[PDB]
Design a protein around this ligand. Structure first.
Ligand SMILES: [Ca+2]
Ligand SMILES: [Ca+2]
Ligand SMILES: [Ca+2]
Ligand SMILES: [Ca+2]
Lengths: 101, 101
């Protein structure tokens, strides 16, 4: 069973929202599913606004369905790479509220 | 045993390509990696144009790296669902030239 999900989102191409605004959308999208913005910030562990626009998070399969239909949500994929050495989606890391360089 | 891949692709949005053109691109992209359109058509077993944008296929890991040099290839992911009952990506099936309705 898949416990970790890649949520791919879409943003208006013009004018394009800023990196910060995209990340805020991710967190608000997770917060909607999880219950709270604080849960979201402690859950999400990776994301992108460049190589792709989406984020990675941990929910059970049934809950991952709640992402479909939410504004901006495009595609809900299982995270194959969270635990594979030397493979990733080309994303950035996010740890408990802080973007990692 | 065998390695099964979801190849995720991206297409321009203005103008957008047609379904037929995307499917052709999947087969072209696979054919380039394989070195044969004939092999590509026997190999590819599923794809999407709606629910997602990409296709599934069976090659070894080394050969699958050839996709990453090709235009439109975003991710080269392991197929998560090919051997899992009652779970799939929602893609359409493709069988030796037949798009399966
Ligand atoms: Ca955390
Ligand atoms: Ca990894
Ligand atoms: Ca990543
Ligand atoms: Ca499928």
């Amino acid at each position: 069973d898949y416990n970790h999900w890649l949520i791919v989102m879409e943003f208006p191409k013009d004018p394009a929202p800023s990196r910060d605004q995209m990340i805020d959308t991710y967190l608000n999208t997770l917060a909607t599913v999880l219950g709270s913005m604080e849960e979201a910030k402690k859950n999400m562990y990776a994301f992108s606004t460049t190589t792709y626009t989406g984020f990675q998070c941990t929910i059970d399969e049934e809950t991952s369905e709640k992402f479909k239909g939410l504004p901006g949500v495009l595609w809900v994929l299982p995270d194959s790479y969270i635990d594979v050495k030397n493979k990733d989606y080309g994303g950035d890391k996010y740890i408990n509220g802080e973007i990692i360089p």
